[PDB]
Amino acid sequence: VVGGDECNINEHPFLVALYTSASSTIHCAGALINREWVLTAAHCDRRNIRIKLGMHSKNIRNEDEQIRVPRGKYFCLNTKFPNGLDKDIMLIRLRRPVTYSTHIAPVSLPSRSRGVGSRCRIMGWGKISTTTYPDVPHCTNIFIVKHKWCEPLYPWVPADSRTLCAGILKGGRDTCHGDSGGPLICNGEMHGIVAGGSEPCGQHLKPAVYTKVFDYNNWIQSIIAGNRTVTCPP
């Protein structure tokens, strides 16, 4: 994330970090949903995902840090593009659950649908300048801007797709490489999964795309419950 600071150590207990069995670099984040389920971006998928929960600093371990691996991964299959980017979202089922604690806590799924001009916060362990990865997660605040801004810049995001266009129109504040799959939090609920935006990050007049979690609420809840024939919202 760019144009923000270190996150308060207790503000991100649902933030999980994704890296691969082969590499220690965080390639994406995600959100803990209940003891056994993480929500994240489809393009974050890889062959041997590892998930670190209850982390803040890459270097100073926490009491309650946990490493997990996937047992199930679940996608939208009815997507407007073969690569599935128009609907960048995925659910992972953890091999063993976790137990909650100060730094491990389920985020809250939206309840009402919130829109343009709301105040939202972004977090993650992705890039903070031109080529640096911070060792602690950074956070800042953005707003939902009007979709119009995103459409023209991102083909994979058609008009009236299920996304929130968000950022700071003037530059400085935005997510970046490696933030994918991390929550966009508004009124203490996850309204957003980081999908993408422009490279380099936070450039003038160039908001980013967040999968509108609220739309997938039912899809998410069937998937959790055990249903395997359910489809993503059209």
Ligand SMILES: *C[C@@](*)(O)[C@H](CCCNC(N)=[NH2+])NC(=O)[C@@H]1CCCN1C(=O)[C@H](N)Cc1ccccc1
């Ligand atoms: C995979 C994620 O780390 C990453 C999120 C980066 C978002 N950054 C900014 N500036 N807000 N997503 C990207 O790499 C995604 C997946 C691959 C393509 N992509 C992009 O951001 C492209 N530049 C195009 C894009 C795809 C989907 C939605 C919007 C834009």
Ligand SMILES: *[C@@H]1O[C@H](CO)[C@@H](O)[C@H](O)[C@H]1NC(C)=O
């Ligand atoms: C499974 O999937 C769909 C959800 O729309 C539906 O046909 C069915 O009611 C679901 N429930 C169960 C218990 O299989």
